[PDB]
From a paper:
The chromatin structure is altered by modifying the DNA–histone contacts, thus opening up or closing down sections of DNA to specific transcription factors that regulate the transcription of genes.
The Ssr4 sequence has little homology to other sequences in the Protein Data Bank, so the structure was solved using an iodine derivative with SAD phasing. As there were no homologous structures in the PDB which might serve as a molecular-replacement model for this protein structure, we attempted to use several different methods for de novo phasing: xenon, bromine and iodine soaks and native sulfur SAD phasing. The Ssr4 structure was solved using a crystal that had been soaked with iodine and which showed two major peaks for I atoms in the electron density (about 40σ and 30σ above the background), with three more peaks (12σ, 11σ and 5.5σ) that corresponded to either low-occupancy I or Cl atoms (some of these peaks are also seen in non-iodine-soaked structures). Auto-Rickshaw was used to find the iodines, phase the data and build the initial structure via Buccaneer. Although the sulfur, bromine and iodine data sets all showed some anomalous signal in the scaled statistics, only the iodine data set had sufficient signal to solve the structure. Density was seen for residues extending from the N-terminal tag to residue 179/180 of the Ssr4 protein in all three structures. The N-terminal tag used for purification forms a helix from residues −9 to −2 and there is a break in the density in two of the three structures where the residues Ser1 and Ala2 should reside (Ser1 is the last residue of the tag and Ala2 is the first residue of native Ssr4). These two residues were modelled into one of the models as there is some weak density in the iodine-phased data, with a break at Gly0.
Author numbering: -11 to 180
Write the structure that this text describes.
């Protein structure tokens, strides 16, 4: 009466390792962790669309040799790129960023496949910023057997996009609890 949707995504025998690792985390932090690949990606400025498609395509081909950990992500620096496992019908865990506007959802046709682009401009870190300075993009490429994997990218906003920021009217509306617990799991696989 609480976890039906999550349970659908943990049916795989390789998703058994992910499930076992999540159950090792205190219940209160299970909703707070990202399932993030142990790469790490080199940081990058805003990526051209063909680069996004190649990065997700290569990740999908390398998946059996890439491990994941449940981890907290908080106030990642500009340039940060992550490969994450996430159900599209579940909310993203927190990253410490708040937004003065709604995330916009665009779809592109790429070589006959759909690339989803979830672009959240007007990002800010309320503990340290009074104006917006950051963009977060979440990408996924559909119909190539990698539907629940995302590229998540944080980068610097343009000066002209910067607007005054106030947590009282931002999304999400609540500041996360600091300091963060240490909760990073040992690595596991999502395909064998
Ligand atoms: Cl475990
Ligand atoms: Cl808006
Ligand atoms: Cl998938
Ligand atoms: Cl929200």
């Amino acid at each position: 009466h609480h976890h039906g949707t999550e349970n659908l995504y943990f049916q795989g025998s390789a998703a058994t390792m992910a499930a076992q690792s999540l159950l090792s985390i205190p219940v209160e932090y299970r909703s707070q962790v990202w399932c993030r690949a142990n790469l790490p990606y080199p940081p990058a400025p805003q990526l051209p669309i063909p680069a996004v498609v190649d990065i997700l395509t290569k990740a999908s081909q390398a998946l059996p040799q890439i491990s994941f950990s449940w981890t907290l992500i908080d106030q990642p620096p500009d340039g940060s790129l992550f490969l994450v496992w996430q159900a599209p019908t579940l909310p993203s865990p927190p990253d410490g960023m708040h937004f003065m506007s709604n995330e916009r959802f665009f779809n592109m046709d790429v070589a006959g496949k759909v690339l989803e682009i979830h672009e959240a401009k007007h990002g800010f870190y309320p503990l340290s910023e009074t104006r917006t300075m950051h963009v977060r993009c979440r990408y996924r490429l559909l119909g190539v057997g990698f539907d629940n994997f995302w590229l998540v990218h944080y980068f610097q906003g343009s000066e002209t996009d910067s607007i005054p920021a106030n947590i009282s009217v931002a999304k999400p509306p609540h500041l996360r609890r600091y300091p963060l617990p240490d909760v990073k799991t040992s690595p596991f696989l999502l395909q064998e």
